[PDB]
Amino acid sequence: AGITGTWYNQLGSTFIVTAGADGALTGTYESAVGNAESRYVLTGRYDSAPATDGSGTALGWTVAWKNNYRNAHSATTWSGQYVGGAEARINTQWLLTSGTTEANAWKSTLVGHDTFTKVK
């Protein structure tokens, strides 16, 4: 599967990911320091038997931005695919939804993209 390990996005954010044989993604967001106050849980799913036609491996995961120290009242989902080979990558599009009032629901969800590599 090649997914398990530490991944870094284009801005250097760090994600520790374990790909279970059953399709589970588990792990954490860590800060550059790895301090407890900036650690958040991630959970998701991936295709544990991808196509053998050189297609990437579809996946997704979520981080809710609460831990025992901080709560931003928001959550991000990343949707994408893992691409193996010499320079393995996870190419994703993300949505960041913040909890809002109904009046402010229109501005609840930011969109962007993250590309993850096994090197900083």
Author numbering: 15 to 134
Give sentences copied directly from the paper behind this entry.
All peptides bind within or near the biotin binding pocket of streptavidin formed by two surface loops [1/2 (amino acids 22–28) and 3/4 (amino acids 42–52)], and by antiparallel β-sheets involved in an extensive polar interaction network, in which residues Ser88 and Thr90 of β-strand 6 play a major role. The surface loops of streptavidin are flexible: upon biotin binding they undergo a conformational change to form a closed conformation, but to accommodate the peptide ligands, loop 3/4 is dislocated by 13–16 Å from the biotin closed form to adopt a well-defined peptide-specific structure. All eight L- and D-peptides discovered in this work bind to the same pocket of streptavidin in distinctive binding modes suggesting (1) the rich malleability of L- and D-peptides and (2) the ability of streptavidin itself to adjust the flexible loop to accommodate multiple peptides with diverse sequences and conformations.
Two 5-mer hotspots, “wqeea” and “lanvd”, were selected for the extension step with all 160,000 possible combinations of D-amino acid dimers. All D-peptides fold into a left-handed α-helix with one turn for GyGlanvdessG and two turns each for the Gdlwqheatwkkq and GGwhdeatwkpG peptides. D-Ala is critical to the core motif because its short sidechain perfectly accommodates the limited space within the pocket. The Gdlwqheatwkkq, GGwhdeatwkpG and GNSFDDWLASKG peptides bind with the same N-terminus to C-terminus directionality, opposite to the binding orientation of all other peptides.
